[PDB]
Amino acid sequence: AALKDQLIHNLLKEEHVPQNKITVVGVGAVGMACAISILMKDLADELALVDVMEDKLKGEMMDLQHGSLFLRTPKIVSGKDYSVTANSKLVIITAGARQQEGESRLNLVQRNVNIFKFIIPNVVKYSPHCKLLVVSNPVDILTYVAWKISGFPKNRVIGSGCNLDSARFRYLMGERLGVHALSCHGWILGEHGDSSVPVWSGMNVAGVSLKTLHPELGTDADKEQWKQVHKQVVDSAYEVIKLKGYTSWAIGLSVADLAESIMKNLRRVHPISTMLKGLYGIKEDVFLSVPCVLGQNGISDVVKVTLTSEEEAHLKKSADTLWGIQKELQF
Amino acid sequence: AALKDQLIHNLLKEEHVPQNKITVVGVGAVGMACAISILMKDLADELALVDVMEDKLKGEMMDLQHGSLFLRTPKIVSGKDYSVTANSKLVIITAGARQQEGESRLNLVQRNVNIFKFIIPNVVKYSPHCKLLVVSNPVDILTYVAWKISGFPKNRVIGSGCNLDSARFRYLMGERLGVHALSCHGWILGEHGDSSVPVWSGMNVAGVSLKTLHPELGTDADKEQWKQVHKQVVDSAYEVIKLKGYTSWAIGLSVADLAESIMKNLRRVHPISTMLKGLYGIKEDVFLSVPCVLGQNGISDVVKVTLTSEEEAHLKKSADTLWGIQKELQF
Amino acid sequence: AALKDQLIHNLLKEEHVPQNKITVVGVGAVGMACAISILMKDLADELALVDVMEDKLKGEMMDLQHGSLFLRTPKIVSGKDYSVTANSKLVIITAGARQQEGESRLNLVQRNVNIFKFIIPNVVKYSPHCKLLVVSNPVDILTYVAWKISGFPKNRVIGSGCNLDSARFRYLMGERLGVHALSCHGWILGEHGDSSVPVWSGMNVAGVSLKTLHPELGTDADKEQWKQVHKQVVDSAYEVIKLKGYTSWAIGLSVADLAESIMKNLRRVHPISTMLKGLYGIKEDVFLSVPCVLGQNGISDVVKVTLTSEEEAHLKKSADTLWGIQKELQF
Amino acid sequence: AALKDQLIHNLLKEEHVPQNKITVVGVGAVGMACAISILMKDLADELALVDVMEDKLKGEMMDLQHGSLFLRTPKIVSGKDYSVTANSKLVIITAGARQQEGESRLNLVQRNVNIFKFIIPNVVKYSPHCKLLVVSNPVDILTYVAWKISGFPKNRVIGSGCNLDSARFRYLMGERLGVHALSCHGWILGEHGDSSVPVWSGMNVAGVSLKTLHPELGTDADKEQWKQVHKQVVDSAYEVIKLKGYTSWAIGLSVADLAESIMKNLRRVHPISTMLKGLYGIKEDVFLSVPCVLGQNGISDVVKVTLTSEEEAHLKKSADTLWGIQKELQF
């Protein structure tokens, strides 16, 4: 009688346990940009979305599903119940608290802790073996928060950190020199924000050190003002937010690049945030960006970058500031 | 010497004539979804954005530019002046008023006609040889308006039409039958809107006609309610608008599918908006969706679908409705 | 004080188990076209090659490895010992004996059976959960042979069957009609070779049945001679071998498309060879091509195409011939 | 009442000039690896193949065409007559007699010059505005020969040079250090062959100079013997040929990466051979590999690498050797 049975003879029943699943938590502009970038790079065989507002969540799921003909990811699901996230290889956290006028730094972080106390145990319950990738800001502190609540080993808790900062730096270098960002090399490390560290000694094109060629590179009194290129990077989100209200596209592409290294076990090096105690002279439980080898087991190795005394002092001062906030948090 | 001159020896003075340029008009949610999809499919060597609000326009340009490292489109430009659009191969028009929750796309015509009076002459002035792809609603009427204003031959003026309607239909078919939309075949023709026509005789999997297998298909007297699948297609935009306020992702992917056929000269068949005088008993200059062969010179051929008496009458009345609106337009 | 230890601090020891591994058995021209096509479509995180000629095998492995910079498959391995194939999701069999001057079909099949008696138990020992895709000719008999030796359930033993035949048919359709093969639809079923069945009733563009428009379609006295298009398909490998010595590129692309459906769980429909007992009027353990739903567990469903008396009789005639040979084989 | 005319209504007569056409000259194993890699990267809207053997040419064309369903390059053509190559943007030269140990290098130059005296003028007749990419060996001499015969400006005549050599080097670096070749950086410059120059000062991971970390790098007294990695690179082609008879896959992927930079105007930096008179201390009309900015107008800029006195002297000795051969050629 039924059309499906007249057309199709079934040979095998339903044991659907996903094999290459990714979850995005939060369907704000950042989360949806991560989602569309992951879908157009064929990184997952199932995509799950979760957030607390049911109507926008279902509408975003339906909008993506209606494009299925043009994609190669056959299952897209969503819900406020974290059961929809079960058996994920990778869970990307973009949700957080909305900022309030006149609230202190410590109060903002604690409000995000209170949200993570609900999100993280739910994630761990349904995907006990996943990798966690935290994007929510302030990212170095909130990556620590996810690590603390989850109980996961440090190799499986990753912060997006300075990955986009470095991409922006390479684009701006490329604009100045007349070359693609792919062929400009340079690293921004440390705390994601106003105190990140541009490692001038490593900037190069085709292996030619820009500092040896132009020795005053990175000093304020440089007639070409290369120090203001780093200031442009730290101010980039501020300028884009003032023009269009928020940033989305670039972080979505940077996050999908990280997901590609994880899902395909590439062991590429990225400037991302990892638990740094015992390395680079740090003695507290803080997360900072260094060049990390990224693959299917998360962060397996760290590159030991040679830093000047000025550069080391910036990192150590960031570690002190982060721990000062973290030791006052209520878990 | 400058650092650039110490590092790089220039051998050639170049003139910037782009060879595969695409312009998106409008940086609303639809326009930006078209932009990110075209960028992630490597369809252009230069992308230009144009709209009337300068701050929002510059912010979106900067956000995309910040993702350059992850892309293979080396030049992204923008501006309110249409000189930034010069020498485009393809110009995609997405600006205009969008439907409220439960509003007919036909209720937008007077507002969007007035906007097209400014846009189309500016586009034609700076890219006299481009193809025009209209996405703004009502898309069938606005493609006619663009054709009249531009003076272009009809093969170069295309509406996105029912490409998305048919993609939605194939997705819903696949969900009912347990197969990917790629392997479900079926066509929605006519108005992109409430009077679209589902061609039941062409619906098939692996060449097996579903109507011959299940003769009740498409009638009210069908226990399985397949006629309601077309109603789901007609209601799709309304349901997503009710949940998130607008639609974006699916139309962006549908538009990128059309741009791929044009830029790569594929000569694939799509259900898109074209001038159908002389067809199905129509003697006025109305545009609506039929299956069209799409390539680098636009629409070169149309497939002549066999319709039932009921299907053809439904096309003819919808064409009369569109003409009733068109003949009263002032531009 | 090794350079690797000065540069990199190890944080994690790892016993690496790959998650999306593919093996190609046989590094002849067919096997290597499959390998390059799979590598350029980013379907696997590890590729293994196996063959009996040690030097040629190592040379092909090294040549592919030296392109790693341009790929996203981080590990390529090879060896005569099947331990290099352990934990594969998908194993593709292209090895076998070539047809001899003055030899029966029972004796050519037996020479290939003896090859499969060594290969298949080795594959099963190291990848007990894999799907098997047999490409070696005669493909329908050798897929039966692989199934019998492996002990696998029928859903995990797949023959490439008529998949390329149908792609060639769609290309030739497109050449005659002036449209891309993507927009021409048609199915070749049954036994891969001179006795395959072109299903004239399912051929269409945009859902328009060519048979209804052109009732002579599929008859000998057809002024347009469409039956000769099927004859061109069955002769194609023959014509290419006479021109260049062998065929490879098209089959490599066809096999990678099947691998994509499996690895991404797409549930697309393909005309491939499956154990057909109990369906289409067949009563014995034979494999023939029908439209099959293909995903991460292999063939889960079969489409039941409505066939004419003549069409059904062709399939029954093929099953009788195949079973007659199979019962004479020495396992 | 032909089927095509009942099915399709023509609206536009054919006048077709392709917009992104590529020609490959030579359908040996190298030429065909370039062809399949270019096809699987969607770089062209038309691909032409040309060579002197008509049967093999037609067989390779047919094999590729039969895979059209799986590709997005809609037109593939071939012939011995160079009219089939008309209006190419990029023409890739792979034909010639192959380098063989024991066969005089000076005699091979003479044999391949005469082949180019036939090929180059035929290419330029039909594509007067193309870029030339020379892959045939000896590559630095034959790029000069193509430049003299065509009369093209030097930016439009490019040799594949040391591009693959450097890719091989990065793979071998990655195997030693435990990271992907993408994250290992290093440059092989100069004359392609036994006298190429590995630039130890530019080798780095994440901007960390290996030479500063390990000052004996590249010296005979290096306990890890990294000089033997450069020897591995120069010997790689010969070792692969000894194992499987020829080399093809890696060069195909390397050539397709250069083709991507040209067709998409990327302005990425590659170590490829360019006319370097006036730079690096060279005064004669010679081509050697240096880091070159590559885009839609060929090579527009050159990076000036800081070299040691010994490295600088090696490049001069290579230039003297090349001009000694070139000074006796007649065009």
CSV table of C-alpha atoms in Angstrom, one decimal, chain C residues 16-233:
chain,number,residue,atom,x,y,z
C,16,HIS,CA,47.4,5.9,16.8
C,17,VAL,CA,44.3,4.2,15.5
C,18,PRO,CA,43.1,5.9,12.3
C,19,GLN,CA,39.4,6.8,12.0
C,20,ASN,CA,38.8,7.0,8.2
C,21,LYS,CA,41.3,4.6,6.6
C,22,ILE,CA,41.0,3.3,3.1
C,23,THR,CA,43.0,0.5,1.4
C,24,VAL,CA,43.5,-0.1,-2.3
C,25,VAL,CA,44.5,-3.6,-3.3
C,26,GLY,CA,46.5,-3.6,-6.6
C,27,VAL,CA,48.7,-0.8,-7.9
C,28,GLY,CA,48.1,-1.3,-11.6
C,29,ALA,CA,46.7,1.6,-13.6
C,30,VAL,CA,43.2,1.1,-12.2
C,31,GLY,CA,44.3,0.9,-8.6
C,32,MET,CA,46.5,4.1,-8.9
C,33,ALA,CA,43.7,6.1,-10.5
C,34,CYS,CA,41.4,5.1,-7.6
C,35,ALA,CA,44.2,6.2,-5.2
C,36,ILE,CA,44.8,9.6,-6.7
C,37,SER,CA,41.1,10.4,-7.0
C,38,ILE,CA,40.4,9.4,-3.4
C,39,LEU,CA,43.4,11.5,-2.3
C,40,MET,CA,42.2,14.6,-4.2
C,41,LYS,CA,38.7,14.3,-2.6
C,42,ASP,CA,39.8,14.3,1.1
C,43,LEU,CA,37.9,11.1,1.9
C,44,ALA,CA,40.5,9.4,4.2
C,45,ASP,CA,42.9,10.2,7.0
C,46,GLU,CA,45.2,7.2,6.0
C,47,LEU,CA,45.6,5.4,2.7
C,48,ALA,CA,47.2,2.0,2.5
C,49,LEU,CA,48.4,0.3,-0.8
C,50,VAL,CA,49.1,-3.5,-1.2
C,51,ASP,CA,50.4,-5.5,-4.1
C,52,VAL,CA,52.7,-8.5,-4.8
C,53,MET,CA,55.4,-6.6,-6.7
C,54,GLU,CA,57.5,-5.0,-4.0
C,55,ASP,CA,59.6,-2.5,-5.9
C,56,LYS,CA,56.6,-1.1,-8.0
C,57,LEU,CA,54.6,-0.8,-4.8
C,58,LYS,CA,57.2,1.1,-2.9
C,59,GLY,CA,57.8,3.4,-5.9
C,60,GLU,CA,54.1,4.3,-6.1
C,61,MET,CA,53.9,5.0,-2.4
C,62,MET,CA,56.9,7.3,-2.4
C,63,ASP,CA,55.6,9.2,-5.5
C,64,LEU,CA,52.3,9.9,-3.7
C,65,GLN,CA,54.1,10.8,-0.4
C,66,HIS,CA,56.2,13.4,-2.1
C,67,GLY,CA,53.0,15.3,-2.9
C,68,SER,CA,51.9,15.5,0.8
C,69,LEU,CA,52.2,19.3,0.9
C,70,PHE,CA,49.4,19.5,-1.6
C,71,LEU,CA,47.1,17.0,0.1
C,72,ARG,CA,45.0,16.6,3.3
C,73,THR,CA,45.6,12.9,3.9
C,74,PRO,CA,48.5,12.8,6.4
C,75,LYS,CA,49.6,9.2,6.3
C,76,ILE,CA,50.3,7.0,3.2
C,77,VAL,CA,51.6,3.4,3.8
C,78,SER,CA,52.3,0.3,1.8
C,79,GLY,CA,53.5,-3.3,2.0
C,80,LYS,CA,53.1,-6.9,0.8
C,81,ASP,CA,52.1,-7.9,4.3
C,82,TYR,CA,48.4,-7.1,4.9
C,83,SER,CA,49.3,-5.8,8.5
C,84,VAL,CA,49.7,-2.4,6.8
C,85,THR,CA,45.9,-2.5,6.0
C,86,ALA,CA,44.7,-2.9,9.6
C,87,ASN,CA,41.6,-1.0,10.8
C,88,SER,CA,40.4,0.0,7.3
C,89,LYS,CA,36.8,1.3,6.9
C,90,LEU,CA,36.8,0.5,3.2
C,91,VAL,CA,39.0,-1.9,1.1
C,92,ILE,CA,38.9,-1.7,-2.7
C,93,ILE,CA,40.0,-4.8,-4.7
C,94,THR,CA,41.4,-4.1,-8.1
C,95,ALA,CA,43.9,-7.0,-8.4
C,96,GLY,CA,43.4,-10.0,-10.6
C,97,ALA,CA,44.3,-12.0,-13.8
C,98,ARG,CA,43.9,-10.7,-17.3
C,99,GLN,CA,42.1,-12.6,-20.1
C,100,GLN,CA,44.4,-15.1,-21.9
C,101,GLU,CA,44.8,-16.1,-25.5
C,102,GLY,CA,42.5,-19.0,-26.0
C,103,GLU,CA,41.0,-19.6,-22.5
C,104,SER,CA,37.5,-20.4,-21.3
C,105,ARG,CA,35.5,-18.2,-19.0
C,106,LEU,CA,35.4,-20.9,-16.3
C,107,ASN,CA,39.2,-21.0,-16.5
C,108,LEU,CA,39.8,-17.3,-16.3
C,109,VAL,CA,37.4,-17.1,-13.4
C,110,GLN,CA,39.2,-19.9,-11.6
C,111,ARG,CA,42.6,-18.1,-12.0
C,112,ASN,CA,41.0,-15.1,-10.4
C,113,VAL,CA,39.4,-17.2,-7.7
C,114,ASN,CA,42.8,-18.5,-6.7
C,115,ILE,CA,44.1,-14.9,-6.4
C,116,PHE,CA,41.1,-14.0,-4.2
C,117,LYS,CA,41.6,-17.1,-1.9
C,118,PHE,CA,44.8,-15.4,-0.7
C,119,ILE,CA,43.7,-11.7,-0.7
C,120,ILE,CA,40.3,-11.9,1.0
C,121,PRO,CA,41.2,-13.9,4.2
C,122,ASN,CA,44.2,-11.5,4.7
C,123,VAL,CA,41.9,-8.5,4.4
C,124,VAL,CA,39.3,-9.9,6.8
C,125,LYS,CA,42.0,-10.8,9.4
C,126,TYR,CA,43.2,-7.2,9.7
C,127,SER,CA,39.9,-5.3,9.1
C,128,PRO,CA,37.1,-7.5,10.3
C,129,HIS,CA,34.6,-4.5,10.3
C,130,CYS,CA,35.3,-3.2,6.8
C,131,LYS,CA,33.2,-2.8,3.7
C,132,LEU,CA,34.6,-4.6,0.6
C,133,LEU,CA,34.3,-2.9,-2.9
C,134,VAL,CA,35.2,-5.3,-5.7
C,135,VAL,CA,36.3,-3.7,-9.0
C,136,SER,CA,38.2,-6.6,-10.6
C,137,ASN,CA,36.5,-8.3,-13.7
C,138,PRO,CA,34.3,-10.2,-14.1
C,139,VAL,CA,32.9,-8.1,-11.4
C,140,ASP,CA,29.6,-9.8,-10.7
C,141,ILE,CA,31.2,-13.2,-10.2
C,142,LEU,CA,34.2,-12.0,-8.3
C,143,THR,CA,31.9,-10.0,-5.9
C,144,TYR,CA,30.1,-13.3,-5.2
C,145,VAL,CA,33.5,-15.0,-4.7
C,146,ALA,CA,34.6,-12.3,-2.2
C,147,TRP,CA,31.3,-12.7,-0.3
C,148,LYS,CA,31.7,-16.5,0.0
C,149,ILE,CA,35.3,-16.3,1.2
C,150,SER,CA,34.9,-13.4,3.6
C,151,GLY,CA,31.8,-14.6,5.6
C,152,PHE,CA,30.6,-10.9,5.6
C,153,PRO,CA,26.9,-10.1,5.6
C,154,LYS,CA,25.6,-9.2,2.2
C,155,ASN,CA,25.3,-5.4,3.0
C,156,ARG,CA,29.1,-5.1,3.3
C,157,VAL,CA,30.1,-6.8,0.0
C,158,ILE,CA,29.6,-4.4,-3.0
C,159,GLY,CA,30.6,-4.7,-6.7
C,160,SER,CA,31.3,-1.7,-8.8
C,161,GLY,CA,28.9,-3.2,-11.3
C,162,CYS,CA,27.2,-0.9,-13.8
C,163,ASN,CA,28.1,2.4,-12.0
C,164,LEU,CA,30.6,3.6,-14.7
C,165,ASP,CA,28.4,2.1,-17.5
C,166,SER,CA,25.6,4.5,-16.4
C,167,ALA,CA,28.0,7.5,-16.1
C,168,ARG,CA,29.2,6.8,-19.7
C,169,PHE,CA,25.5,6.6,-20.9
C,170,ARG,CA,24.7,9.9,-19.3
C,171,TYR,CA,27.7,11.6,-20.9
C,172,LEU,CA,26.7,10.2,-24.3
C,173,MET,CA,23.1,11.3,-23.7
C,174,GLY,CA,24.4,14.8,-22.9
C,175,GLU,CA,26.5,15.0,-26.1
C,176,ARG,CA,23.4,14.2,-28.2
C,177,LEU,CA,21.1,16.6,-26.4
C,178,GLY,CA,23.4,19.5,-25.7
C,179,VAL,CA,23.2,19.4,-21.9
C,180,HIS,CA,25.6,18.4,-19.1
C,181,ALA,CA,25.7,14.7,-18.0
C,182,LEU,CA,24.5,15.9,-14.6
C,183,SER,CA,21.1,16.9,-16.1
C,184,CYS,CA,20.7,13.7,-18.1
C,185,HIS,CA,19.2,10.7,-16.3
C,186,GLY,CA,19.3,7.0,-17.2
C,187,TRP,CA,20.1,3.6,-15.7
C,188,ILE,CA,22.1,0.5,-17.0
C,189,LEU,CA,21.3,-2.6,-14.9
C,190,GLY,CA,22.1,-6.3,-14.6
C,191,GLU,CA,25.3,-8.1,-15.6
C,192,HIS,CA,28.3,-5.7,-16.4
C,193,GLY,CA,29.2,-6.5,-20.0
C,194,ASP,CA,27.4,-7.1,-23.4
C,195,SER,CA,24.2,-8.3,-21.7
C,196,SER,CA,23.5,-5.3,-19.4
C,197,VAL,CA,20.0,-3.8,-19.6
C,198,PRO,CA,19.4,-0.1,-20.6
C,199,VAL,CA,16.1,0.9,-18.9
C,200,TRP,CA,14.6,3.0,-21.7
C,201,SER,CA,11.5,3.8,-19.6
C,202,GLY,CA,13.5,5.8,-17.0
C,203,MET,CA,15.5,8.1,-19.3
C,204,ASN,CA,14.6,11.7,-18.8
C,205,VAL,CA,15.7,15.4,-18.8
C,206,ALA,CA,14.0,17.5,-16.1
C,207,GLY,CA,11.6,14.7,-15.5
C,208,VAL,CA,10.4,14.6,-19.1
C,209,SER,CA,10.3,11.0,-20.2
C,210,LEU,CA,12.1,10.6,-23.5
C,211,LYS,CA,10.2,7.4,-24.3
C,212,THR,CA,6.8,9.1,-24.1
C,213,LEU,CA,8.1,11.9,-26.4
C,214,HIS,CA,9.9,9.5,-28.8
C,215,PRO,CA,8.1,6.1,-28.8
C,216,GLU,CA,10.7,4.4,-31.0
C,217,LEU,CA,13.3,4.8,-28.2
C,218,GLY,CA,14.9,1.5,-27.5
C,219,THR,CA,13.8,-0.3,-30.7
C,220,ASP,CA,16.0,-1.6,-33.5
C,221,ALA,CA,14.3,0.4,-36.3
C,222,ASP,CA,14.7,3.7,-34.5
C,223,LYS,CA,15.7,6.4,-37.0
C,224,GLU,CA,17.8,8.0,-34.3
C,225,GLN,CA,19.4,4.7,-33.4
C,226,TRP,CA,19.4,5.2,-29.6
C,227,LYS,CA,20.0,1.5,-29.0
C,228,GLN,CA,23.5,2.2,-30.5
C,229,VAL,CA,24.2,4.5,-27.5
C,230,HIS,CA,24.0,1.4,-25.3
C,231,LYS,CA,26.2,-0.5,-27.7
C,232,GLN,CA,28.7,2.4,-27.5
C,233,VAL,CA,28.7,2.0,-23.7
